[PDB]
Symmetry: D2
Subunit: 504 residues, 4 copies
């Protein structure tokens, strides 16, 4: 009845029998590359596998994808318990990176550091000289500008502008390693959004059959469509997730969202570009707008960073990941925790626990009450059935909303209204089953059975397939009642048929 | 905005904060912030309550600090319009290494010292049950009966028996770091949200402590994860935010106070006051106490006739406290001649307490107008409202009233 | 959003664009028995034909019923524009009547105000009544009345108060004076009269209704729940599908309304003779209470008597009658019954036309959204698919501003449960059962249509044909057009257990 | 819905919140009868200036005030009684029957004449009326209605000074009966010479309200306001809507008028009889939205002129007027010339008290809140809002001009509004507004302001406990100013009943 009293009833000693509705995306790297480890990671709750193309070769990532798909299809023998695992391609984009250390160096406060463009010191960086790959650096920043190196752990101040160099004073010190990312906040970064390397990697994704692309450093709508053109006709089905990681992306969010399939909120990279006391507002703004438009939103960076070396996360991390879920994030991404961490499996397992516990603190009723009031007054048959199905899901105490779909668009439209009941998406399309994980609350199942001659025989077969899996995952028992969404005729165009069927 | 989602959607990071910072700021005063000149700058920056950790330091050491807090505070007493009341808190040591005594021999000595030093509130450490709260109440006695007891939840048993503690206490402190080692980390946020929620329902203050801005001890800027951690705590419905080592021994104490003001004022824009009040009105037991009736009616009017503030003429503070439990968007200007209640009012979120130093007029009605006019001048100076605006004034009916039942819709002169 | 706003922007110069959703029942007597008149009455609005079995023999009514069906089936050649006409049998019921005054049945004796009068059960006085002595055919008068009770003679014009009780005699005091004729109705306010639910004639009349294949029975003078089941048992297994509408005619019927409603299919509020029993300042509350309780239950309620009585002699009704009928519609009544206006009056056609005008004007004053909003919260929590799909269809009817709700029903039940929640859009009940199409008129909002097409062997095609049939009628009646969107409720597979399927379909 | 919870056996547990206006004629003129009428529930006494001399009405007013001030000994039980003046206006009236009523039969021929020799010789064949310009404004086929529309005539032949009509709807024709000409450009002045003399007499008699007959446009109300002028600036003008143009140009009339009377009987003749119920609901609704009193008149308990008990159709009609949101309901011939005048007022009190049980006050308030676009208004909303929240027994309002209490009644609370006033005229005028229980304070003004309020609140608290509005332990809401000689009624205090 009230959100306030809903928070008052939260018991920590009471185990949560609420399904972990958010999708877990894991960055696959050197520590989780093997087939055997991936098998366990899928069981723990991995839904999407991210491949970071900032490092490694095409051949390296090709073997990674093979290991991901081998571990996934090891459960294909049992379609009742099978889980679709999506493949993701994270682009490098316009990055500025440091060189190599001669022979990690320790930087002291107030010390003079010379950032050069001379390729003689490319692989000879020390406590005095530094090299980076952005040739137009002295043309974009003036005297007094702040240069951030390695997650913004090392901060510099330009004392004097040079020709092919920059004289900087160290404000924040630390262990400066090789090949580290460089940030220039408030600079006219004139690097292309889609570099020549990005064009190579994006086309490789088309050939490796990726389900989604995480496009880095997206600043405007024209950037998104440049990624759309590179994917072309053969990659028209691949979902483009635009990563917001600077101030311009926050400023021009409306045009980015309207051009993109989804948005990734990189809170670490954003925290360096914009002031720290404003990042929480940007996260809550961007997630809320993605909820309004009904497009997937992923939270990345600074999630469980402590789990790279320790088998347990801290308090602040557990609270921060949970608050992202409460904001309305569809997915939450693990970076170095699963990529190169000492405890990759535990990083996935803890994420399942943190997200599942956050589910109890979500007041679903209000979300649907509010989303239907902003839902445009339309006569769209699918949209009217989507509202009606979620409306009926709350009133019938429904175990699930079974949605029969080919494209996924009808199942995605149900997810927009955020129901308590999990949305079982029945499909024969393997890609749309993988891509369904981007959305919160959608439980995708892949029907392997052939298309039945009669239309009614096919629907009842797919409904009974979803009924079996829903009972297997404990969503609903025998005496429960669920909602089924289908079309009316073969080649319908609209998923407008809603029926309230009791579970056999 | 008609919608909480719409309220989140319209948020703009480039837009300067329009709403004043309703959250309370509590600072641990130690070696770094002990000096009068530093304390003066913290009061200007936004410090409301001064904390003294009795885990270390002698009674001589703390009495010198309390004197310095009051030396810094009373320098602003020259301007009654701009003067800010600063509360003095006493954080008791608490038994450390369970049926260990609720109040140790040192704690009893420290508590009685607080009564002598005229402290405003006690942060009772390691509270596990209701008998622990009553034992602290016993030590304070009749001389410290107006001192507020804020129970510190630090263990698993503190969470399990929270309801008997809250009813007995005057307020609650969520020690998040201390709770983090006692219970699993993936559960602390739920415990934090439950406690803050139940405190909001009860009408009793709630404070968030430990692991707020720990990085500001050595660095002049916080990590963005801390900025989120502080903001969400405020967004849960917390009244006050407590800084520990950032102000006590850290290298950047003044910067920590200013950063606390910036985060909490930014988190203020993400708060939906329409939902908070409507839910608190529904869940509240329907009257029939004339004050609770007038408190609800005033908060509803603050939205309906779009008021700039709620002026409350209170003596003990309880009236402004019962208006604060319903969470209005407009600030609650609590006018009082009592210094202690002006100091203790910072515990409640949304209250701007002002100390009236004017003499009591022989005619009651004239004294009310004088107290109201003072609140108008303060409100205009703080930029809460202007001449054209309308405010809601709350008073008692006659000299020596048991109720604050009188309500006035009054245009600003 | 405001109900007051609706009243503020009402215009009398503006004709009603809102459709008349409340069913019209007409009594067929001497003035309207002719097929030609019955043809014109169906055109004007008539939905249900009422036969008053209080007068006229079985032979007389059988011709009228035949005449009603002759006039109805003349429009059968066009399935799109055909309107089913229901047959209603109004029973005579139990009635207390006096004897004859001093011989002849035309003789009339004056009665003093404040004088003593005696009532006897001795049958020797049955044709020997005067100023002092009166006779009643009710043999059990003494055991239902007590000292100080009221006895009303002839439509409540003569009131009496009993002073002393006996074994089979009553001495009474006269309060209301006037002339007293022979064999006239007697009323007992607040008294639990134990006359049998069905009279010996009613047993004959109810069996006759089954033989004439009636749709509904207006069971007269219902006082308790067992009275309804008495009529039910008489109609038997053969007349199980005949709807029983209980008539509330006295104080006991109002007091024991809940048990009557839970035992009946519908309710009739006969305000006229109910006004004789209970005081005038309480009749309107009884009317508003009973109609409200019927809406919550989801069972039809009809208002009767004192409707357009002036139209028996005049071509136009009075203001008070126009407002009285409109208020009854606004209370939430499903049907509105005409008595002497259509039966024995001078202007039976002008009466049916006027009823269409008032009931259509009242529809504008009704705020449809609120009716559903208050009925949604009061609906007890149930996981029954048939009721759960019904709430979703009415939810969408306001959401996507639908032209109509198309319901494929066989027994009527599916359409009834949708009508319970009162949507603005009409409920087109597509049925193959002729009786279902006729009985549906009892519910407000239901526009029944009779599909005469053969059952298509492919189930999906049989639905599409019935849906396209409703789509054809909907355009013809002007409920919706090409651009509009409608809601369709169906089963799932041939011989479905529930009507669980709902569709949002555009109009071709 | 609380409609299902209604019970006819249980006595009404709520006060009769609507006002009762009774017409005073020969059958209720006496002081003895008037006393019992005030006891039975009469609030406003209407004087119909269509009949009787100025000498006749002055004695009637005297008798009303003599009967009212007999209860003045007990200020707790005292009820203020208002005096109303109903103007004649543009009326058309028949002549006098020679030799008594004549029988008019359907199909017969009746001649309408303007001959002054025939003005007192009216019969079955010939009939005289006072409208001298009837020939110029009426046409062949036009309908002429006589005696409140009971008798109808259709014009068959026109003449220079005569009209030949056919009797369409027959009946019994009395003397000096009212004549209607629907759809005719009646060039009779809105304010006649008699109307000027009657209004000036009203000011002389110190009347509280004027019932303005046959108002078609806004300038008709302004013309009445001019005749009252400076001396009668505080007399409330209630415009009667009796014709079609009054409905068409309603928004301009309401703006110029203090209140509205819905003459349903006259309206049912001038417009189609079926569309009247919509007009009644529209005019009441617009009056409730504007915060001005609306009265329902004519065809209330008409059968009570002859019978001691009304029909159920009359009871259901009178109740529905209240249920539409009417402030007052007026009796005409039932109390003026009827055989049972006292019983008519008692039925009125019963019906309106029973109809009160079927009103959902929370619905009305939540709807009137949103349509509202000032400290006095803001405090008026808050008082009604709180009255539901703390189940208040009453809303006590200290008022001088009455406006403060009128602002409260506008939002239609469930709790009775007790208006404490020292102004006698505002105490009498307060009956126009629904849910306002006016009470006249005759106590001297206390030197200390807070003392004057606490004494007045105690006076209202004694009245409320006597009327059964509340008791010890209940909660009331008090509305006052802040100081003596103040602007706004912005003070709201919640006070428990001792
Ligand atoms: N789609 C995710 C999360 C999820 C689980 C269960 C129900 C709904 C969503 C998965 O299948 O793992
Ligand atoms: N109570 C705190 C915060 C606050 C400011 C302004 C209004 C309300 C609350 C203070 O006065 O400093
Ligand atoms: N069922 C009635 C009334 C009605 C009309 C239109 C829509 C709904 C109901 C008829 O067919 O005439
Ligand atoms: N105004 C009328 C009716 C009324 C009675 C009681 C309460 C409110 C109104 C009177 O005082 O007599």
């Amino acid at each position: 009845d009230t959100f306030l009293e809903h928070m008052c009833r939260l018991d920590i000693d009471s185990p949560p029998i609420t399904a972990r509705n958010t999708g877990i995306i894991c960055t696959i790297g050197p520590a989780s590359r093997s087939v055997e480890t991936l098998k366990e990671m899928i069981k723990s709750g991995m839904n999407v596998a991210r491949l970071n193309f900032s490092h490694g070769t095409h051949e390296y990532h090709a073997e990674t994808i093979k290991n991901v798909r081998t571990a996934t299809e090891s459960f294909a023998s049992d379609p009742i318990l099978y889980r679709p695992v999506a493949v993701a391609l994270d682009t490098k984009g316009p990055e500025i990176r440091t060189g190599l250390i001669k022979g990690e160096v320790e930087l002291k406060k107030g010390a003079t550091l010379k950032i050069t463009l001379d390729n003689a010191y490319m692989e000879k960086c020390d406590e005095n000289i530094l090299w980076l790959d952005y040739k137009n650096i002295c043309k974009v920043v003036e005297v007094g500008s702040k240069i951030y190196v390695d997650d913004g752990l090392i901060s510099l101040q330009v004392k004097q502008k040079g020709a092919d160099f920059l004289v900087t004073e160290v404000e924040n010190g630390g262990s400066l390693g090789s090949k580290k990312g460089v940030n220039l906040p408030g600079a006219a970064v004139d690097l292309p959004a889609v570099s020549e390397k990005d064009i190579q990697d994006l086309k490789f994704g088309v050939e490796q059959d990726v389900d989604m692309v995480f496009a880095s450093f997206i600043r405007k709508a024209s950037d998104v469509h440049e990624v759309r053109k590179v994917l072309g006709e053969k990659g028209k089905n691949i979902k483009i997730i635009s990563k917001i990681e600077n101030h311009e992306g926050v400023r021009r969010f409306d045009e980015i969202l309207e051009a993109s399939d989804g948005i990734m909120v990189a809170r670490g990279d954003l925290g360096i570009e914009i002031p720290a006391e404003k990042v929480f507002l940007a996260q809550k703004m961007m997630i809320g707008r993605c909820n309004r438009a009904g497009k997937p939103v992923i939270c990345a960076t600074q999630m469980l960073e402590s789990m790279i070396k320790k088998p347990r996360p801290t308090r602040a991390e557990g609270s921060d990941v949970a608050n992202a879920v409460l904001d309305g994030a569809d997915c939450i991404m693990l970076s170095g925790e699963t990529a190169k961490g000492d405890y990759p499996l535990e990083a996935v397992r803890m994420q399942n626990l943190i997200a599942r516990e956050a589910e109890a603190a979500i007041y679903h009723l209000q979300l649907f009450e509010e989303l239907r009031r902003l839902a445009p007054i339309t006569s769209d048959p699918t949209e009217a059935t989507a509202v009606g199905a979620v409306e009926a899901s709350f009133k019938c105490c429904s175990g699930a909303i079974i949605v029969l779909t080919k494209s996924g668009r009808s199942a995605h439209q149900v997810a927009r209204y955020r129901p308590r009941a999990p949305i079982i998406a029945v499909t024969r399309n393997p890609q749309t089953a993988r891509q369904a994980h981007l959305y919160r609350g959608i439980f995708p199942v892949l029907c392997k059975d052939p298309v039945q001659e009669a239309w009614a025989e096919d629907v009842d077969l797919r409904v009974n397939f979803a009924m079996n899996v829903g009972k297997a995952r404990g969503f609903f028992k025998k005496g429960d009642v669920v909602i089924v969404l289908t079309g009316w005729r073969p080649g319908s165009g609209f998923t407008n048929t809603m029926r309230v069927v009791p579970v056999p």
